[PDB]
Design a protein around this nucleic acid. Structure first.
Length: 68
DNA sequence: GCCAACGTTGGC
DNA sequence: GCCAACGTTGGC
């Protein structure tokens, strides 16, 4: 399920999807959803949308935490 | 050797 | 044409 990510602005949720098939079966991808449902797949994609709203330079994309 | 990042595939 | 799932690799 999509769980709230406190490091990001209110309404931002993150979800982790285990791959089901193929040679990378078992690995996982992380996605974020904006307050309005829009899907982000990488830290630079989040960065382009959020801009000056929050400094994502210490943001660990995979876990959803600022790692100082 | 690993994986972030994002192109490509397959199904719709 | 859209998009979720998977392949792929340059940079580390």
């Amino acid at each position: 399920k999509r769980m709230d990510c406190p490091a990001l602005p209110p309404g931002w949720k993150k979800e982790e999807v285990i791959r089901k098939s193929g040679l990378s079966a078992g690995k996982s991808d992380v996605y974020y959803f904006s307050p309005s449902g829009k899907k982000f797949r990488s830290k630079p994609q989040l960065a382009r949308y959020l801009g000056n709203t929050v400094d994502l330079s210490s943001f660990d994309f995979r876990t959803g935490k600022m790692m100082p």
